[PDB]
Design a protein around this ligand. Structure first.
Ligand SMILES: [Zn+2]
Lengths: 196, 406, 115, 200, 263, 193, 156, 83, 126
């Protein structure tokens, strides 16, 4: 079953070996981003509609560990666009994706492009979570931000700051994702009185 | 069903498929479709169309066949470079239009080499371009270009700070053009180059401070990044060569005579093994120059003896001479031009004779050439050693020493 | 005889190596103990130096025997390679001398033309 | 032989022939460098209906009675001998060969014969030459001048050291027309001597 | 015998190796451990080096035991030594200098038939397997029938002390034995490919001036075709590609290859 | 005379005698082999000792008479006429005639012939002969025949024949092929079952 | 193993003794020195090389407009050739530790829109980056950019 | 002057040095020829004139020898054919 | 003049290495009448080799002392990149050699036809 999803997603992003010898002579434009996304979304929709409810989440953990196992950032952003349209079309419940994205242990701050693209996608898809899920996401995002040192490199700081926009979006009072009392309760549980 | 399978003989498992189709508007013309097939009871693996831009030559067919035959050997080399964690740029069209090349960025640093020498090497490697040549298209050549050469030579190698070394590799007939042995041999040559760069850096650092006799006694001649040819002698005749043999993982020195004044040999061929071991234990070249300068003068005298006398090479600066088998004598060379001779068969401990035995009776002949008291050494000048060993007519042209033992 | 001697010394060389390794081990253990808490008997001990010189002496005797045999065999093969016997040695030495004259002539000419 | 005069052509017909067979020995040398330029030689077998060609590199080709086939084949063989001449000349002048391809596939799709390719480097480092001859488009030679020598290449601020200013750079082309000598090999060595060290 | 000389020379080196290896074990022990930047690293480095040194002593001792099983006058010896030295030196020098020749041009036939006959007889003296039959049916141009075992029957066509045409035929096939069948084919594709490769070897072996070493090398290359049908290709390991035995022998390297496997 | 090997390959499973040849011959065609005519080998026997007379179609005019271990006479076809004339004087035997009839396939200097020794009117068995015309030498061309056989025959490949016998520089002969055929024929006649 | 073992055992006994060398030293100094005698008589370099070995079509330079001289190197190079010079910057962010984390091209769709040819070059170069293998180099991105521009020139 | 590895490396070094310096002298001569041809396009023309005249003389001598042989064989054949 | 002396210097340095190679081959073939011939051959080779040294030396002195007025342009400034009565004598000699080559081609064609006709007849007579 994870073999099925393995064959699907690996057959999505295969790379051509014999190209760069006789470059561009093969008669075939490789599916550009939109057609490839539509085909990927269709095949994953087949596997998802086939899938059972209780098996709904271990496959998502496999998806996110397969995305975080990648190395090319274009590949990662393509599969994140796939996950974004898979949430946006209504196929996926928009809480499992966010939780398995953040609680993935491959998400460390040293993987700065993965950090930036991940928290960009969570900024895109957090608007649909119910408020208790937003509260738990707030807690795990704060605990993810808490692992950064006092000093980091001067180039990675802007890609690290992508979590700050998710935090600013959750604690924004006009957006009203959750009651603000829950937000200050989670914060003051993590930064008690006297802690910067 | 009307297709042609053009197999590539140089690089196997690759098949071009040329199919012909009828064009509807012209009943007297044909259309050609070219595909790149590959095979592993033959099993096909992948297939890809390739059809984009006297009349019997079909120019595009021969063009595609030549392009495939020229490009496909590079794919295996790229895969092998990627499999050994060697960061390399993709196959790129060279500036002179027609070509293919795989320029490496960084090599795996080394094993068994100090960190500072690794840094000095990594900051001097400018380019590691690989190219293909040779009939049947199966010879590879890597051109390494180093900068800031430590020390130059007597030859015309004192040009701009850019030394170009070409390393060629030709795999066997089997084991196709793209394989593991080529890059393995390349890494072996790189390791040898690094282990030699160790000694060249040591020598370059020690060049400003020289005991001032080895400077005129020895001179560097060539530096091809894989061999060190130093030359020593009063007339700059003798030559020693340093090289690292990765097969045995030990330094290999080769001695020769290049100069229009010398004996019949390098005169150091009797101490070649002890010098090999000496340089293998402590890789320092200034010690080699010093011991050569110290031991050349006694060796020039000990080589001209009649070959009766037998030369047993013991540890360095301890050459043994033995008239017949009954007699013996030890040659202890030391600095400042002195040699200490011994009784030979005598034992440096409890007074018992060795297997050869036959205690040399006179002993005091060495004292005038200035009971068991031959066992203690007697120093000389190398000039008294010249007189004691070069054959003078008698006070047949025999030596003094062989007259004594005779 | 040269092959026979090489055979005779080989068992002795193995014996000398065994004693040199064993004596070294005994000396190192006593020296470490003297330094260490363990106090070891004075005993005979046997000096390591005497054994190391004995091994070297056997090695020289073997090398001398082999070097002589190799030189003797090389001379014999060369002699075979090169009616009365006095005239035979005479024509050999004559050929040898004329080759040397050719040598000297080529040498002196090639050295007088330049350098 | 009368029309094409640049590389060379030679033919030595055999003494004994037959009523249904004959043989020649074609050689394509250079005008001045006969010794070194001896890499391409042919031995035609003129049968009753087919001409069999045996090249020196172990390649047997069965041509036709059609003159165009033989003419195109001989033109391609001359084009290949042209690059073999440069190879054998670089072997003699001590120039280091960097690359050699007998049938190159990069460039314009060529005529009856496939294009040849060679690239050699000067013995003293910096300078280098490249040659591409073909039956239709040939004699495309371009010298590789070193950097800091053209003075027209756009500099970059990323290059903050002078060590990188010694590599062979701008790849300037040379016109094979309006040159000296009388043969491709004459012009090739004159160009090699021009890019040599001035010992005058 | 020469085999004894090599065994003695190998043994002399083995004694030198044993003495050096024993000195190395003690000399390294005297220096003792080095810092190595880490406690585990220093202990490992000392143990590894000592064990390698101890093993080398064992290996060198074993070789000496195994090698035991296998095995007016002085001027004459000086002349012998100088003759051997000049022979080796001049051989190496001639090889290295004729390998790389700087000659670029010539500008700055008639031959006695008995001389060609003598050259052919000298070449036939060596290679006892090959038998060359001289004949002059048409003019001074000689025609050689060369029988190689039960394998080949080559028809060389000399115009002078020069090789012009070669047509190999099978042993069972008929060369017609008489007025010689110069113009014919073998009727077998393998022998036709061998004729093509022989013409290729002729075009390859072409010395400019000396007309004897060319024929010597041609006969030597032909003699390599005595292990035909009995050798495997050195590229594919196969005996048959498209029903053909390996047909090419590399010049400078008498090894077998199917001509499709270039080699 | 080119080194040859003949072996019998069992039909196996429930494959009919003819069905197996049809398949084996198609497998040979799948080697790029091209048919080069037809071959008929008809042999008659005599109970005199025992006489054998066989004639391959590959040889147009020869008739081979083999006397077991005794010498083989390669003679013209008029030999059969002499045999018939003697017939009243000669022994005849009882319907021991054996024939193998099959297609000839040529694969680049190797001729492969697969046929069904049809005994009398009823087929039983299969004979495969691979010949090499270029290979005049024999007994060490075995490596070749073996490699080619493992290519197509696969299982049931013969581990040589004894007609090669003692190692010798003796050339292979048409008589040797006929002796192989005679041993094969004695085996079909008696294999039974 | 054979004939050496007690020596091996001895030294394997006595490692981690602090006085260890003394003891070795003592018992091994005199005999040896008696017998043998006296003793003896900003921007990473890989990026600089990749830049030095580019085709003269490119004129790569640093980026002081956004992050400058920090570590990962932003680059605006150029396109200069017989082809087309559409949108020369293609800002490339090469992260530190170059033989990993293949560099990413910061997308700028604001300039590649408004004209069909630029939209086509953007589409084809993006697809070419999708088909590029993992751990690609800077030269790979430059070459695929050039060939994508060329495809847009010929396909249109 | 008054084992195998020594002579081996020695001949390697001396022969390679001789070859390099010979190729360098050849390069110098070729440079001088190139300069004289490009800047003095008159001595090269005189050289071509001399070479062409020598070629014509050689061709004339060869045709003379061929005519002598042809006349000899013509007389020989005229002698035969008779009865 | 000087451009031909330079070609002479080229041929001398191209021939000296061949002479040394012949000397090496002669010393190699000298294994231990014929000895006198080998000795005089080696001596003649050495004498001609020294004469070649003298010739190359003198032509070197000549080309170095010449240095005609027209050499202000250093090397690499002469290669062309992308971006009277002597000619009449040349044309006359060219026309003459063209006519002679056409005649020689006719002669060679006739000789080839003769040889082919004789070979065919002597082959078919059998
Ligand atoms: Zn093969």
């Amino acid at each position: 079953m994870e073999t099925q999803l393995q064959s699907i997603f690996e057959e999505v992003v295969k790379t051509e070996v014999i190209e760069e010898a006789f470059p561009g002579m093969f008669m075939d434009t490789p599916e550009d981003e939109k057609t490839k996304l539509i085909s990927c979304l269709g095949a994953f929709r087949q596997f998802w509609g086939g899938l059972s409810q209780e098996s709904h989440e271990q496959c998502i953990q496999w998806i996110v560990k397969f995305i975080h196992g990648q190395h090319s950032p274009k590949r990662i952003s393509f599969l994140y666009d796939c996950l974004a349209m898979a949430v946006e079309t209504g196929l996926l419940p928009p809480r499992l994706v966010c939780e398995s994205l953040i609680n993935s242990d491959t998400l460390e701050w040293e993987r700065t492009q993965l950090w930036a693209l991940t928290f960009k996608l969570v900024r895109k898809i957090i608007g649909g979570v119910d408020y208790k899920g937003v509260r738990d996401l707030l807690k795990v995002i704060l605990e993810k931000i808490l692992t950064i040192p006092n000093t980091v490199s001067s180039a990675v700081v802007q890609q690290l700051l992508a979590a700050r926009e998710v935090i600013a979006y959750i604690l924004e009072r006009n957006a009203c994702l959750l009651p603000a009392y829950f937000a200050v309760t989670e914060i003051r549980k993590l930064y008690p009185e006297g802690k910067l | 069903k009307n297709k042609l399978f053009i197999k590539l003989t140089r690089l196997p498992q690759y098949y071009i498929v040329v199919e012909m189709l009828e064009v509807p508007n012209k009943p007297t013309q044909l259309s050609y479709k070219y595909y790149f097939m590959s095979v592993n009871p033959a099993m096909a693996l992948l297939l890809q169309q390739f059809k984009e831009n006297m009349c019997a030559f079909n120019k595009v067919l021969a063009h595609f066949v030549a392009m495939c035959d020229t490009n496909m050997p590079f794919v295996g080399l790229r895969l092998e470079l990627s499999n050994l964690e060697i960061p390399h740029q993709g196959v790129q069209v060279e500036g002179d239009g027609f070509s293919h090349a795989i320029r490496l960025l960084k090599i795996p640093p080394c094993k068994g080499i100090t960190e500072e020498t690794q840094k000095a090497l990594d900051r001097s490697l400018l380019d590691c371009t690989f190219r293909l040549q040779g009939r049947n298209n199966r010879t590879w050549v890597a051109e390494l270009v180093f900068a800031n050469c430590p020390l130059n030579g007597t030859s015309t190698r004192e040009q701009g700070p850019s030394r170009h070394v070409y390393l060629t590799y030709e795999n066997l007939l089997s084991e196709p053009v793209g394989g593991r042995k080529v890059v393995e041999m390349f890494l072996n040559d790189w390791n040898s180059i690094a282990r030699l760069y160790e000694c060249v850096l040591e020598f370059a650092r020690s060049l400003p401070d020289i005991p001032a006799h080895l400077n005129i006694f020895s001179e560097v001649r060539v530096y091809n990044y894989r061999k060190l040819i130093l030359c020593y002698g009063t007339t700059k005749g003798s030559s020693i060569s340093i090289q690292w043999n990765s097969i045995h993982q030990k330094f290999h020195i080769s001695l020769g005579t290049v100069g229009p004044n010398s004996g019949c040999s390098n005169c150091h061929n009797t101490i070649l093994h002890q010098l090999q071991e000496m340089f293998n234990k402590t890789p320092n070249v200034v010690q080699l120059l010093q011991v050569l300068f110290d031991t050349q003068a006694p060796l020039n005298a000990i080589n001209k003896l009649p070959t009766c006398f037998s030369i047993l090479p013991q540890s360095s600066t301890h050459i043994r001479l033995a008239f017949r088998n009954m007699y013996c004598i030890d040659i202890y060379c030391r600095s400042r031009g002195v040699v200490a001779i011994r009784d030979g068969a005598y034992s440096l401990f409890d007074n018992s004779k060795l297997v050869e035995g036959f205690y040399p009776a006179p002993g005091l002949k060495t004292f005038l050439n200035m009971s068991w008291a031959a066992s203690i050494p007697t120093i000389l000048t190398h000039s008294a050693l010249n007189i004691l060993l070069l054959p003078s007519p008698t006070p047949y042209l025999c030596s003094p020493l062989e007259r004594f033992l005779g | 005889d040269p092959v026979q001697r090489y055979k005779m010394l080989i068992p002795q060389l193995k014996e000398s190596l065994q004693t040199l390794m064993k004596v070294a081990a005994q000396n190192l253990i006593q020296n470490t103990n003297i330094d260490n808490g363990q106090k070891s008997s004075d005993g005979p001990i046997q000096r390591f130096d005497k054994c190391l010189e004995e091994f070297y002496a056997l090695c020289d005797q073997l090398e001398l025997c082999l070097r002589l045999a190799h030189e003797c065999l090389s001379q014999s093969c060369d002699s075979a390679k090169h009616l009365p016997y006095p005239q035979y040695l005479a024509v050999i030495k004559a050929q040898i001398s004329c080759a040397k004259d050719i040598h000297t002539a080529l040498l002196d000419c090639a050295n007088k033309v330049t350098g | 032989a009368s029309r094409i005069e640049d590389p060379q052509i030679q033919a030595h017909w055999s003494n004994i022939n037959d009523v249904y067979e004959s043989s020649v020995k074609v050689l394509i040398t250079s005008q001045g460098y006969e010794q070194i330029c001896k890499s391409i030689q042919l031995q035609l077998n003129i049968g009753v209906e087919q001409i069999r060609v045996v090249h020196r590199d172990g390649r047997v080709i069965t041509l036709s009675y059609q003159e165009q086939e033989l003419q195109d084949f001989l033109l391609s063989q001359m084009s290949q001998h042209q690059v073999h001449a440069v190879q054998q000349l670089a072997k003699v002048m001590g120039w280091q060969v960097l690359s050699f391809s007998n049938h190159v596939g990069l460039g314009p799709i060529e005529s009856i014969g496939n294009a040849s390719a060679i690239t050699v480097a000067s013995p003293s480092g910096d300078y280098a030459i490249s040659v591409r001859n073909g039956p239709e488009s040939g004699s495309k030679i371009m010298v590789q001048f070193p950097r800091n020598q053209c003075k027209d290449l756009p500099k970059s601020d990323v290059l903050q050291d002078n060590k990188w200013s010694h590599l062979r750079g701008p790849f300037k082309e040379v016109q094979w027309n309006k040159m000296e000598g009388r043969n491709f090999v004459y012009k090739m060595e004159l160009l090699m001597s021009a890019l040599s060290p001035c010992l005058l | 015998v020469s085999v004894n000389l090599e065994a003695f020379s190998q043994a002399i080196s083995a004694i030198q190796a044993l003495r050096s290896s024993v000195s190395r074990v003690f000399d390294c022990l005297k220096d003792g451990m080095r810092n190595k930047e880490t406690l585990e690293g220093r202990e490992k480095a000392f143990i590894a080096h000592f064990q390698d040194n101890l093993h080398s002593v064992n290996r060198d001792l074993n070789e000496l035991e195994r090698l035991s099983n296998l095995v007016l006058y002085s001027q004459l010896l000086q002349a012998y030594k100088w003759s051997n030295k000049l022979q080796y030196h001049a051989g190496l020098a001639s090889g290295l200098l004729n390998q790389q020749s700087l000659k670029r041009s010539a500008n700055q036939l008639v031959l006695p038939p008995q001389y060609v006959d003598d050259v052919i007889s000298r070449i036939d003296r060596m290679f006892p397997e090959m038998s060359i039959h001289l004949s002059r049916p048409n003019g001074t141009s000689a025609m050689l029938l060369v029988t190689l075992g039960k394998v080949l029957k080559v028809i060389v066509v000399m115009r002078s002390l020069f090789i012009d045409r070669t047509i190999v035929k099978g042993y069972n096939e008929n060369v017609y034995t008489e007025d010689l069948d110069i113009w014919s084919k073998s009727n077998y594709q393998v022998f036709q490919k061998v004729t093509d490769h022989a013409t290729t070897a002729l075009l390859h072996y072409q010395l400019p001036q000396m007309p004897d070493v060319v024929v010597r090398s041609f006969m030597t290359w032909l003699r390599s075709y005595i292990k035909l049908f009995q050798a495997p290709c050195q590229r594919c390991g196969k005996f048959l590609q498209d029903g053909l035995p390996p047909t090419w022998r590399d010049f400078r390297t008498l090894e077998a290859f199917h001509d499709t496997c270039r080699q | 005379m080119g080194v040859t090997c003949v072996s019998q390959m069992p039909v196996a499973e429930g494959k009919s005698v003819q069905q197996t040849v049809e398949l084996l011959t198609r497998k040979l065609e799948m080697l790029g082999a091209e048919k080069q005519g037809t071959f008929c080998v008809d042999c008659e026997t005599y109970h005199t000792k025992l006489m054998y007379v066989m004639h391959n179609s590959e040889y147009p005019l020869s008739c081979f008479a083999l006397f077991e271990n005794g010498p083989c006479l390669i003679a013209d076809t008029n030999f059969d006429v002499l045999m018939v004339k003697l017939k009243g004087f000669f022994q005849s035997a009882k319907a021991s005639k054996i024939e193998t009839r099959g297609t000839r396939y040529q694969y680049c200097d190797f001729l492969v012939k697969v046929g069904t020794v049809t005994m009398g009117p009823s087929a039983r068995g299969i004979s495969v002969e691979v010949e090499y015309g270029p290979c005049v030498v024999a007994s060490d061309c075995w490596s070749l025949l073996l490699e080619f056989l493992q290519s197509f025959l696969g299982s049931h490949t013969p581990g040589a024949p004894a007609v090669f016998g003692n190692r010798h520089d003796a050339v292979y002969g048409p008589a040797d092929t006929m002796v192989q055929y005679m041993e094969l024929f004695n085996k079909i006649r008696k294999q039974q079952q | 193993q054979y004939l050496c073992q007690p020596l091996l055992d001895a030294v394997l006994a006595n490692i981690r003794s602090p006085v260890f060398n003394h003891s070795l030293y003592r018992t091994f100094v005199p005999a040896m020195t008696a017998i043998h005698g006296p003793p003896i008589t900003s921007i990473p370099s890989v990026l600089q090389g990749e830049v030095a070995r580019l085709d003269p079509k490119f004129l790569v330079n640093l980026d002081p407009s956004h992050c400058s001289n920090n570590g990962t190197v932003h680059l605006i190079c150029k396109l200069d050739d017989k082809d087309l010079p559409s949108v020369p910057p293609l800002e490339l962010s090469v992260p530190a530790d170059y033989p990993a984390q293949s560099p990413l091209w910061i997308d700028r769709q604001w300039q590649y829109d408004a004209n069909p040819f630029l939209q086509s070059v953007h589409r084809c170069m993006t697809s070419r980056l999708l088909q590029l293998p993992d751990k690609h180099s800077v030269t790979a991105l430059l070459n695929t950019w050039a060939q994508s521009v060329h495809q847009a020139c010929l396909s249109a | 002057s008054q084992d195998q590895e020594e002579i081996r490396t020695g001949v390697d070094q001396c022969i390679q040095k001789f070859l390099d310096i010979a190729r360098q002298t050849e390069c110098f001569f070729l440079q001088k020829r190139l300069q004289l041809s490009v800047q003095k396009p008159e001595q090269v023309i005189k050289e071509d004139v001399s070479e062409l005249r020598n070629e014509l003389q050689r061709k004339d001598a060869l045709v003379q020898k061929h005519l002598t042989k042809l006349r000899h064989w013509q007389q020989v054949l005229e002698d035969i054919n008779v009865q | 003049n000087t451009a031909s002396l330079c070609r002479i210097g080229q041929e001398t340095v191209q021939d000296i290495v061949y002479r040394t190679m012949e000397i090496f081959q002669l010393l190699r073939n000298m294994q231990l009448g014929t000895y006198q011939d080998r000795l005089t051959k080696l001596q003649d080779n050495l004498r001609q080799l020294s004469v070649l040294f003298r010739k190359l030396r003198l032509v070197y002195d000549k080309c170095n002392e010449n240095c005609g007025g027209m050499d202000p342009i250093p090397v690499e400034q002469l290669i062309p990149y992308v971006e009277s009565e002597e000619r009449r004598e040349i044309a006359e000699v060219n026309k003459k050699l063209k006519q002679k080559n056409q005649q020689l081609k006719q002669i060679m064609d006739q000789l080839r036809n003769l040889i082919w006709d004789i070979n065919a007849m002597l082959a078919m007579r059998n």
